[PDB]
């Protein structure tokens, strides 16, 4: 079945206008070759498949990169790639333009005899649909994030700082087996709760604060991503008002997302309600995006998206309202798209919790 991914990638070649592909992106390398290491490249023709790397990694590669010829280069990877392009008969070699640096582009082009053709999206098409094994891991990563939410509720009080909360979330997910958090944790309290991207700061949490907690677990190479907004003591009617709207919009999203909607449709489940209630101006981001090896990947549940959702897509549903000078709320779940609806894999409570 590393066999089968290679076969499915090869099926894309003619459309892309290539007879081979050079994969340099770490996520593509990990995805196609199950290589967890730091170095090396994958070179795949219509007929052969190679993992090229340095002396250090040869043992690891030979064990993980099952389905690949393990090729060891004697110092200069580009020179080895060029050697193998000629051995594989490749005449029109694809590369990943959205990762490959201009420098490495020039170096490769000079060295290699074939046409060197920019490509985008090839391994991404394969990663879009999660296998059952990937689903199991993502469920585990969500479980660890849920455990940390339940944990952190006994930690947040007035006088603790936002970074302190971020540090305890990081500590607890690791204790439960996460490699680490899956992105720079957001703990955004009081007026900062109006900042959708409010990475934890030195600010001290005070009574009356809404606190948005946006974090996830990086577990066996996969990412979860949960957001919950709690209150520390009694929140304002206006903050309560916004919370209720976000919650309701979010449930409409989870309840209505299914295979066959476009990204625009999926986003409209949440944005229709927030807009109807008069806060469209204040929902300045999309309803969500894909998650897997990366914290943000295809598809986009966004008003511009025409992408049709299919089973096995893993995505976030995360509407919010942000009013500068007042505060904000976001509530985010992770789901797996199914034929009929979806599966919510983040199960922490979404009701307003006052601490
Ligand atoms: Ca998020």
The C-alpha angle with vertex 158 and arms to 285 and 249, in degrees rounded to 5, equals 30
**Integer Rg of the chain from CA:** 23
Distance CA 149, CA 270 (A): 24
Numbered residues of the known binding site? 214, 225, 318, 332
Rounded to an integer, what distance in angstroms lies between the CA atom of residue 35 and that of residue 5? 14
Task: Write down the experimental method used for this entry.
Answer: X-ray
Give strand pairing partners of 148. Answer: none
Return d(Cα 287, Cα 248) in angstroms, integer: 14
Q: What is the DSSP string of 218-277?
A: EETTEE--EEEEEESSPPPHHHHHHHHHHHHHHHHHHHH--TT-BHHHHHHHHHHHHHHT
Pairing of strands 210-215, 226-231: antiparallel
**Could you tell me the distance, in angstroms and rounded to a whole number, from the CA of residue 286 to the centre of ligand 1?**
11
**Nearest C-alpha neighbor of 343 from the set 147, 130, 125, 126:** 130
Q: 162 CA to middle of ligand 1, Å?
A: 17
Ligand 1: distance of its center to the CA of 202 in Å?
A: 20
Q: What residues are designated binding site for Ca(2+)?
A: 214, 225, 318, 332
Cα of 28 from ligand 1 centre, angstroms: 23
**Encoding tokens for residue 224?**
């979860």
Between CA 48 and CA 274 the distance in angstroms is: 52
Resolution in angstroms comes to 2.0
- Domain 128-355: give its CATH code: 3.90.230.10
**Measured at the alpha carbon of residue 172, what is the angle toward residues 169 and 175, in degrees to the nearest 5?**
150
Question: How many other CB atoms are there within 10 angstroms of residue 2's CB atom?
Answer: 16
Provide CATH 3.90.230.10 ranges for the chain: 128-355
DSSP state of 75: S
227 C-alpha to ligand 1 centroid (Å): 6
* Three-state secondary-structure class, residue 328: strand
Coil, helix or strand at residue 286: coil
**C-alpha of residue 29 to centroid of ligand 1, in Å:** 25
The whole-angstrom separation of Cα 296 and Cα 300 is 9
Residue 116 in tokens: 């060197």
Structural tokens at position 98: 């959205």
203/301 Cα distance (integer angstroms) = 32
Residues lining ion ligand 1 (Cβ < 5 A) are: 214, 225
* CA 279 / ligand 1 centre spacing (Å): 20
Domain limits, CATH 3.40.350.10, in the chain: 1-127
* Ligand 1 center–CA 214 separation, angstroms: 5
Give the helix/strand (H/E) hosting 211.
Answer: strand 210-215
Longest dimension (CA), the chain: 70
Cα 240 to chain centroid distance, Å, stands at: 30
C-alpha span between 249 and 232 (Å, rounded) = 23
1-127 folds as: Creatine Amidinohydrolase; Chain A, domain 1 (3.40.350)
Q: How far apart are CA 309 and CA 129, in angstroms?
A: 10
* Rounded Cα distance, 37 and 293, in Å: 14
Spatial CB neighbours of 81, under 8 Å, sequence gap ≥ 6: 22, 41, 43, 52, 108, 111, 112
């Amino acid at each position: 079945n590393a066999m089968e991914k290679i076969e499915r990638l090869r099926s894309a070649f003619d459309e892309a206008g290539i007879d081979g592909i050079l994969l340099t992106n770490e996520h593509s390398r990990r995805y196609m070759a199950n290589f967890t290491g730091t170095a090396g490249v994958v070179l795949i023709s219509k007929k052969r498949a190679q993992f090229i790397t340095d002396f250090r990694y040869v043992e690891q590669a030979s064990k993980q990169a099952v389905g690949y010829e393990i090729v060891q280069h004697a110092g200069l990877i580009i020179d080895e790639v060029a050697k193998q392009v000629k051995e594989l008969g490749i005449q029109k070699l694809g590369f990943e333009q959205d990762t490959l640096t201009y420098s490495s582009y020039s170096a490769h082009k000079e060295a290699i005899d074939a046409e060197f053709i920019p490509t985008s999206g090839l391994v991404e098409k394969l990663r879009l649909i999660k296998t059952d094994s990937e689903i199991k891991i993502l469920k585990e990563a969500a479980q660890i994030a849920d455990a940390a939410f339940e944990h952190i509720l006994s930690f947040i009080r007035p006088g603790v700082s936002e970074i302190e909360v971020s540090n305890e979330l990081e500590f607890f997910m690791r204790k439960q087996g996460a490699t680490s958090s899956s992105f720079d944790i957001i703990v955004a309290s009081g007026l900062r709760s109006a900042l959708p991207h409010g990475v934890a700061s030195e600010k001290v949490i005070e009574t009356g604060d809404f606190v948005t907690l946006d974090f996830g677990a990086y577990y066996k190479g996969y990412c979860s991503d949960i957001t919950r907004t709690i209150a520390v003591g009694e929140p304002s009617d206006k903050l309560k008002e916004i919370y209720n709207i976000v919650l309701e919009a979010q449930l409409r999203g989870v309840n209505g997302i299914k295979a066959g909607l476009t990204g625009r449709e999926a986003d409209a489940l949440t944005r229709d309600y927030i807009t109807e209630k008069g806060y469209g101006e204040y929902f300045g981001h999309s309803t969500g995006h894909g998650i897997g090896l990366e914290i943000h990947e295809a598809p986009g549940l966004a008003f511009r998206s025409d992408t049709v959702l299919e089973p096995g897509m893993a995505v976030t549903v995360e509407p919010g309202i942000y009013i500068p000078g007042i505060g904000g709320v976001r509530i985010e779940d992770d789901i797996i798209v199914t034929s009929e609806g979806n599966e919510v894999i983040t199960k922490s409570p979404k009701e307003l919790i006052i601490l």
